[PDB]
Structures are given as structure tokens and as C-alpha cells.
Design a protein around this ligand. Structure first.
Ligand SMILES: [Mg+2]
Ligand SMILES: [Mg+2]
Ligand SMILES: [Mg+2]
Ligand SMILES: [Mg+2]
Lengths: 252, 252
């Protein structure tokens, strides 16, 4: 499988998941219908998205790591799938929620070859491959901000901060893309609990890095070794190269 | 002027502003074209929105209080207008920005009779009159959340906080409506700077109050006396009755 397949498989998945969600009323979306393999609840929205996405993905030679059903298949290509990131917003009719896919040639993130995050409320398409990083078919790159007085996405602010603004939209895979296109000067998830799972971050990190961004765990270590399994957890620090060391210091 | 008019006029404005903003590309939206009377810079997006809003509004017996052009007209009816709330999001293409109006029979908030907030990205229409509060034509009400372990919108977290979820979207007039329909259990703007202006909050407060929520200033006092002028500033604490006093306690 190559980056071209992945882009085609992702489009197909994005379409069906956009249908399935659009067709499901809010009151239905919010029902708890099961336990996820990740150990969080599966809402009726998640299940309906994952089923649509899995229908298409299992037909490929892959192993899938997905929030609700867990680890499936035995292929050499691994796919980190958040069938629905921002499930809370989707249950409330808040227009920031996405399906997110990262394809890797290995169970480690450093062998990623494709990232895909698709906003299910607006149809904004972010993805990345060899050619670079794209939003709705147009190349996206990060910002050049040098000052700490920047626009920040941060989970969670818990002290005074020198930021011009802080924002928290409740869809990590999409907010990583808000950073990748330069909308925001950085993405911080410094929650000491280390909450983010591989299917939350992977696509977003890949897109951000291809868009030029410096992306590392809470203390600057490559994310290359993060595994495509359900056990994996992440803190993320992400900014342009000039600003990144500055943030690393700040959150010490 | 009655609440029926205000609806008709607000909807007529929403349309024009949806169009004008829609046909203006991001790269154009973000240009600084002037200094607003409010003392913040006017982006090209603000200008086109406001110009379209005022075109319609000044045909009415009103005094308008607006972010970019300040105070206009001499009507006994005062309208607090944010021609574009969430200007930052709009310049980036994040589907959370609104036009916002609050009509009042006098220059104090207590004499409000119509509230209106329209998301210019999704077309979600919030409003309220005597008959109650509506989102897309269907009635809404605040949540019944009792515990501090609730979903919160907060400007700005700088502490430990017992919330289940914190979010910050960048459109106060829209976020007060996310509160009003029970998407979030409370809306907190506790910034010591007292950053909120009458046209940011007034529509949102009215809608939230009609939807059942208790909305007060930082210390519990009524917002009744807030003036329709450029000078005026606000902190907000909004929640259902059971939760509200718990939150007042929580912050100090
Ligand atoms: Mg779950
Ligand atoms: Mg979930
Ligand atoms: Mg201004
Ligand atoms: Mg402005």
C-alpha cells in the first residue's frame, strides 16, 4: 500500500462517516451503547462512525488500532484510527469533530507515511504525504511566530501564561491541524495524566511535522518510538522550530 | 419596535453578513484596515460585516452600540451589536464565529427584549424573546448539572479545577449559547482585566437567562445595570440555579 491508496481509502472512509453522523440526531448521538476497548464509553456516535470506517479498512492488508474496538487484523501496515475525535462536540452540535487516520509501515510512529484528519462538520480536509501537508487541496505550513506572546492551544492552562490567546476546542486531531496550517502558533498537551492515545495524535503529528512543525513529547524527545497500540499515551509540545525551545523552557 | 421586528431585522442582517463574510477569502479577512472606536483594530472582516449590519439597522429608530463604529443614531431603542464575534476564528476558518444583537428598550441591559446570535459558519441560529429561547427554531434550556465535575467554558483557567471538561472557543456570544442549550454546564469569564464588552455579552446573557440560567457579574450582582456604551465592561458567571452558587464559591 502507498500514500496514494491511503489518500483514496481515507476519502472513502471520510464520506461514509460523514453520512452516518449527519444522519444521526443529537439525542441519539449521545447515548452510551457500550464500553470501548480503550476503557472509555462508546457513544452511539462512535459506534456508528467506527462501523462505517471498519467496513472499508478491514478489506485492506492492515492492522487497525482503533478507540472503540481496539486492535484488529494482522497486516504489516498499521493504522491508528480515531473513528470520531471530539465525540463530545459531535453530541452537542459543535462544529469541530473529525475522523483521523495515520498509516504506518510499522507499529511505530516513525514509519508513518500518511496522515488524514477530516472535519466531519465542515468538510475541511487535512492530510499529508511525501509532497507535503494540505488543507482542502492547498499546501499548508506552520507559522513563524518567535514570541511567547502567541496564539496557543493548550491542555490545560493551570497558571499565569504569557499567551496572546489560549483556546481549547475539544478535538486534538483537529487542533493539531489548526497548528499545522498556522492558525495557531503552538499545540500543548501537558496534562500530567498523559491522556492522549495514539489514534488521537498520530495523524495530527504527522501533518504538523510535514507542514514544518517541531513536534515532541513533553520534554523534547522524538515521538518516533510511540507505538500503535492501546497502551500508548502522549504529551505533545508543538511549535515552529524557533519557538519550540522557548515553550519547552516555559512549561518546566 | 417589538420582538417580532427584532427577529425580522436580525435575520435580515444575518443573511447579509453571512454572504459578505463568505465571499471574502481568509488572506483578505485578516488585513488590518482601521482602528475600531472600541480601541481594538478593525479587521477587513469586521468592516464588511459591520457595514452590512449598519446598512439595515440605521433605517430603524435606534441607537446602535457597535464594536467598530461605536455609538450611532438617537433611537429610544438601543441595540448592542457585535458585527463579528470570534473575529480571530473567522480569519482562520474555524466554524465558530457569530453576528450578535441585543435590542433593549433603554440603555440598560435590564430592558432587553430580544437576543440574537447567529453562527456565520454553520448557520446555527440562537435567539430569545418573551416566548423563550430557541436554537434553530426549537426551544432550549440549560442543564441540570449539580456537581462541580461539570463541562465548563472558562476564560481563563489558571488553577487546579474540578471540571470534567474545560473548553475555550473564542466567541463569547456563541459560547453563552452553548451554555443556554445545555451543551455546557456553565460559562465563566473571570478575567481580572474585565475584558468583555456590552456587545460581546448582551445577546448571550439574554438568551441564557431566558433559557433558565442564572447569569451574574463576578460577585453575584445582577447584570441588569450594565450600560449600552463603549465604556462598559463585564465578567460573567453563568450556570443553572443549583450549580451557580457553588461556582461563585469555587473561584473565591
Ligand atoms: Mg471510548
Ligand atoms: Mg470516545
Ligand atoms: Mg475593533
Ligand atoms: Mg474585533
Amino acid at each position: 500500500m502507498d500514500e496514494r491508496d491511503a489518500l483514496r481509502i481515507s476519502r472513502e472512509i471520510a464520506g461514509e462517516v460523514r453520512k452516518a453522523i449527519a444522519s444521526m440526531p443529537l439525542r441519539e448521538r449521545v447515548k452510551d451503547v457500550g464500553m470501548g476497548k480503550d476503557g472509555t464509553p462508546t457513544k452511539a456516535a462512535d459506534r456508528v462512525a467506527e462501523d462505517a470506517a471498519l467496513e472499508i479498512l478491514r478489506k485492506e492488508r492492515v492492522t487497525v488500532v482503533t478507540e472503540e474496538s481496539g486492535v484488529l487484523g494482522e497486516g504489516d501496515v498499521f493504522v491508528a484510527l480515531d473513528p470520531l475525535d471530539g465525540t463530545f462536540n459531535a453530541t452537542q452540535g459543535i462544529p469541530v469533530y473529525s475522523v483521523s487516520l495515520c498509516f504506518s509501515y510499522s507499529d511505530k510512529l516513525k514509519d508513518a507515511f500518511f496522515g488524514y484528519v477530516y472535519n466531519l462538520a465542515t468538510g475541511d480536509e487535512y492530510y499529508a504525504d511525501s509532497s507535503g501537508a494540505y488543507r482542502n487541496g492547498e499546501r499548508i505550513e506552520v507559522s513563524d511566530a518567535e514570541e511567547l506572546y502567541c496564539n496557543a492551544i493548550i491542555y490545560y492552562p493551570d497558571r499565569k501564561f504569557p499567551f496572546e490567546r489560549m483556546r481549547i476546542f475539544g478535538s486534538a486531531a483537529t487542533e493539531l491541524c489548526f497548528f499545522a496550517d498556522g492558525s495557531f502558533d503552538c499545540f500543548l498537551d501537558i496534562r500530567p495524566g498523559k491522556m492522549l492515545r495514539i489514534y488521537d495524535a498520530a495523524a495530527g503529528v504527522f501533518i504538523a511535522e510535514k507542514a514544518g512543525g517541531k513536534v515532541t513529547e513533553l520534554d523534547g524527545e522524538s515521538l518516533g518510538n510511540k507505538k500503535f497500540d492501546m497502551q500508548e499515551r502522549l504529551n505533545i509540545v508543538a511549535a515552529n522550530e524557533k519557538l519550540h525551545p522557548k515553550l519547552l523552557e516555559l512549561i518546566k
